Ligand binder design. Structure first.
Ligand SMILES: CC(C)(COP(=O)(O)OP(=O)(O)OC[C@H]1O[C@@H](n2cnc3c(N)ncnc32)[C@H](O)[C@@H]1OP(=O)(O)O)[C@@H](O)C(=O)NCCC(=O)NCCS
Ligand SMILES: CC(=O)Nc1cccs1
Length: 313
């Protein structure tokens, strides 16, 4: 195909992730594995605005920035199966750099991740997802982001985070399973000296000696900004109750976290309105019936998705 995944423009981030995954695959040496291609298909500058209640309380008094700048990225992984691309993994992230005001400085937030379970061989699928995620943490660490933030909430039945119409026998993990799955990924990263340690949001706030909501990171679309608006101590109660779902991941700790030079992202902006957050691709897939429910349909949908990405106005 003149519209292959591999022909999508390369990025340092995508190159870094795909090389990590394919090196994992070379080590495993399984006869059914096919080459993985990771492409960043959207990167744009955004700002998240403090909502009214929090603004009135902390912004207007000069205690908190009014908004926080970030870059959003969308990336996708593809495996070559039978000389045909298959998109099997996607993620959108929010990256708050070194000039972003506290509390958000040098943090990354994983907005959404999703998958379609046709990776071959099946016995390496989870392992490959973990390699992608560990790579992403490794990469942002190298650039100088200090902390990663992951929300482990599975989609409710019939809801698709990124890919329209999942396979009917692709089970959706319960929250306990997904939380353990993230722990498994983070433990591997700990072993590899990528992650220093990780904590749920309640344990984090406690160890941080947080006493004011103005000190919690404030991300676009996250649970916490909405919780904070309703509130306007009871907050600490709500952090305890939902603590299992919210991982705070320390990449760089202690003194080496405060002497850092500015973060320099070597990758350019990538305008792609189709991939500016998850809604537009779901809308396109719903309208054009790009389903991901069987290997065959997913390959066809992948091919259509690729054509769109290559031919974007
Ligand atoms: C998160 C995700 C990528 C992990 O996929 P994965 O590595 O294959 O891990 P899962 O936990 O889904 O599946 C592993 C195994 O547990 C099984 N399993 C999953 N959910 C299950 C359930 N509710 N009951 C019983 N078994 C289940 C799977 O069938 C699979 O079994 P197998 O590999 O022996 O066939 C995938 O579940 C997914 O795309 N989920 C939807 C998106 C999402 O939850 N995003 C979360 C954070 S934004
Ligand atoms: C405020 C906060 O830490 N939000 C989080 C989002 C995801 C994991 S932790």
């Amino acid at each position: 195909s003149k519209f292959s995944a591999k022909r999508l423009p390369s990025t340092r981030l995508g190159t870094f992730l795909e090389n990590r995954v394919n090196d994992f695959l070379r080590r495993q040496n399984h006869p059914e594995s096919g080459e993985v291609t990771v492409r960043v298909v959207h990167a744009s500058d955004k700002t998240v605005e403090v909502k009214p209640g929090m603004k009135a309380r902390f912004v207007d008094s000069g205690e908190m920035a009014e908004s926080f700048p970030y870059r959003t990225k969308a990336l996708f992984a593809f495996e070559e199966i039978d000389g045909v691309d298959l998109c099997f993994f996607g993620m959108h992230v929010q990256e708050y750099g070194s000039d972003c005001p506290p509390p958000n400085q040098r943090r990354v937030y994983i907005s959404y991740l999703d998958s379609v379970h046709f990776f071959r061989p099946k016995c390496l699928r989870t392992a490959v997802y973990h390699e992608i995620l560990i790579g992403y943490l490794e990469y942002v660490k190298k650039l100088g982001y200090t902390t990663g933030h992951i929300w482990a909430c599975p989609p409710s039945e019939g809801d698709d985070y990124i890919f329209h119409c999942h396979p009917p026998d692709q089970k959706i993990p319960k929250p306990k399973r997904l939380q353990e799955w993230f722990k498994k990924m983070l433990d591997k990263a700990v072993s590899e000296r990528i992650v220093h340690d990780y904590k749920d949001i309640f344990k984090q706030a406690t160890e941080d000696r947080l006493t004011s909501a103005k000190e919690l990171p404030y991300f676009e679309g996250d649970f916490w900004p909405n919780v904070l608006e309703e509130s306007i101590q009871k907050l600490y109660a709500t952090m305890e109750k939902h603590k299992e779902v919210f991982f705070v991941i320390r990449l760089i700790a202690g003194p080496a976290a405060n002497s850092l030079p500015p973060i320099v992202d070597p990758d350019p902006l990538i305008p792609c309105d189709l991939m500016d957050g998850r809604d537009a691709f779901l809308t396109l897939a719903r309208d054009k019936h790009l389903e991901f429910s069987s290997l065959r349909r997913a390959q066809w949908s992948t091919m259509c998705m690729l054509v769109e990405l290559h031919t974007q106005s």
